[PDB]
Amino acid sequence: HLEEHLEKFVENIRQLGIIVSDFQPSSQAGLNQKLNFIVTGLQDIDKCRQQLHDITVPLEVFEYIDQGRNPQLYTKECLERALAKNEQVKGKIDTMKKFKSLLIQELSKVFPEDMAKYRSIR
Amino acid sequence: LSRNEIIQSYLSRQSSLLSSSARQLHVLVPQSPPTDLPGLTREVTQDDLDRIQASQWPGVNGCQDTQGNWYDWTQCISLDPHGDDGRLNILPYVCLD
Amino acid sequence: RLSTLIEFLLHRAYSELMVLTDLLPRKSDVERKIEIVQFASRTRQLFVRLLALVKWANNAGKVEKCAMISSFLDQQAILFVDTLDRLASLARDALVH
């Protein structure tokens, strides 16, 4: 909340400094100076506000963010891959169950004793 | 260990089937409550010794089979338990050269 | 937490860039200190964009770890099936012995 607002203010100050550097010395150099000082003070205040919390950095999430993609792009692809994997193992298990049922029917046709005990097992 | 190639899998079926292999199946042998020494304490009844040498004893001297053909221990029994062309061939129990 | 440490590191980098811009404007030329300040400002803007992306990643959908755990469980089940097959293999190795 407040940290996002501070980051947005820092981005706006960066844009203003870039515009002042690009335009002309006419733009008050003291104005950009005070802007940079306020930006440093706000960065220190944001560090103080965010100095004891969370702790869960360990992921390629940074590579996906720096890989010209958001969490819905690379994260979406990862979630789709996980969904494909989970759907595939379910198909595996279902086909295994079907083959087992087929062989159970065949072994019941083979021996009544086996049918009688497949029934005790069930 | 991946295997699973259609060719690799197909080799497995032939090799396994070869080692293993209308009933034409051996006659069901009823259990005998008295055995020649411990069960019937019959000890040696000369009759038992005579029967083993020349008479057909269903399990002491041979395997009866169905269709009536009698196969002695030395002989090899060819039988077809599944309803298919392939026939289980049982090799001789004794195999005395 | 981690975002707070990232913001503190970004502030330290901004202070270092300000010191570098001071050194450049001091020993740097008029058309050099301005360029160095513009480069430091671009770096600070990139750091702020990275912080915004980090916030968007900390937010948005919070199920990534859930999907990762589900995939890990599926992989563990597959590994258990493979271990069962290898156990059957060692059992049959003992069967020939």
Binding site: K92 | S2, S16, S19, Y93 | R92
Partner: peptide, 25 residues
């Protein structure tokens, strides 16, 4: 005969192991 019986028992397992392996694969 008895060696054939032992090999047949071992193979009965071979088709179980192999079946499950194929399934997991």
């Amino acid at each position: 005969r008895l060696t054939q019986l032992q090999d047949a028992v071992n193979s009965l397992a071979d088709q179980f192991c192999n079946a499950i392996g194929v399934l997991q694969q």
